[PDB]
Amino acid sequence: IVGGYTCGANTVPYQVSLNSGYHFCGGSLINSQWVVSAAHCYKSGIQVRLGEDNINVVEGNEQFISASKSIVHPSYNSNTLNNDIMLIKLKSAASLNSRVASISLPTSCASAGTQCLISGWGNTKSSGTSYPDVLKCLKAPILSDSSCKSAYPGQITSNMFCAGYLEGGKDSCQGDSGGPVVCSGKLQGIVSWGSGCAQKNKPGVYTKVCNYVSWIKQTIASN
Numbered sequence: 001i002v003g004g005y006t007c008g009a010n011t012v013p014y015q016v017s018l019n020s021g022y023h024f025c026g027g028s029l030i031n032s033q034w035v036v037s038a039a040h041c042y043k044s045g046i047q048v049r050l051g052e053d054n055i056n057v058v059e060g061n062e063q064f065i066s067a068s069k070s071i072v073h074p075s076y077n078s079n080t081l082n083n084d085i086m087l088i089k090l091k092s093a094a095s096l097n098s099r100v101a102s103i104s105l106p107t108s109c110a111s112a113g114t115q116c117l118i119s120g121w122g123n124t125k126s127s128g129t130s131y132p133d134v135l136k137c138l139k140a141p142i143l144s145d146s147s148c149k150s151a152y153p154g155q156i157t158s159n160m161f162c163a164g165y166l167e168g169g170k171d172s173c174q175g176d177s178g179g180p181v182v183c184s185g186k187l188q189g190i191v192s193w194g195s196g197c198a199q200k201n202k203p204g205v206y207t208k209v210c211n212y213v214s215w216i217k218q219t220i221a222s223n
């Protein structure tokens with residue numbers, strides 16, 4: 001997160017860190033045994049870390065659970081990043097409490113101007129690499145489709161939306177990939193791609209979760 005603030009320990013209880021010996025992507029807990037992340041964060045050997053604040057110190061509240069299976073969307077296109085969503089089933093269910101809790105899926109898509117909370121342990125520099133130890137937060141609005149398509153002409157599909165600041169300076173970045181975009185208590189987006197981080201007129205692009213609720217529910221119900 002570039003230009004954001006320290007969230008405060010466990011104030012984002014649905015945030016998870018995907019770990020393979022280091023933090024490589026974020027994710028969101030949607031029920032005690034399933035996490036939603038981005039398809040491009042897929043790899044084998046994933047350990048899901050819940051209740052984290054400092055990812056380099058065991059401070060208490062952490063639950064480390066291995067992923068039993070990862071389900072990348074069948075129509076995921078790695079070249080366009082269209083359908084960039086993945087579901088991860090945990091080997092055992094997590095114990096939910098106030099520090100580890102799931103976030104709700106939306107019943108409707110959000111409108112432009114909706115203010116959302118983006119969080120993660122991704123890079124904090126737009127020019128260079130500085131990864132934080134604790135969770136960072138950023139409040140950002142969903143932009144209109146016209147501004148999004150004007151910034152990325154020919155690259156935005158109906159399963160994507162832009163959120164952020166066109167002046168640059170505040171944005172999500174590498175490492176935040178896979179994590180949550182929560183608006184009014186509902187998970188509306190997944191950190192997917194963007195041109196650099198916090199650059200002027202190049203907002204972040206997010207997977208539009210409201211278009212995948214039936215797919216998520218049907219896939220969880222059959223696995």
Ligand SMILES: CC(C)COc1cccc(-c2nc3cc(C(N)=[NH2+])c(Cl)cc3[nH]2)c1[O-]
Nearest residue numbers: 041172173174177192193194196197204205
């Ligand atoms: C290990 C695998 C997940 C590699 O993934 C990545 C490697 C390098 C950069 C990114 C990345 N940069 C990103 C920048 C932005 C943004 N400008 N808001 C967003 Cl929304 C997602 C990004 N994802 C990224 O997701």
Ligand SMILES: [Ca+2]
Nearest residue numbers: 054055057058
């Ligand atoms: Ca920790």
Ligand SMILES: [Cl-]
Nearest residue numbers: 149153154155
């Ligand atoms: Cl277009």
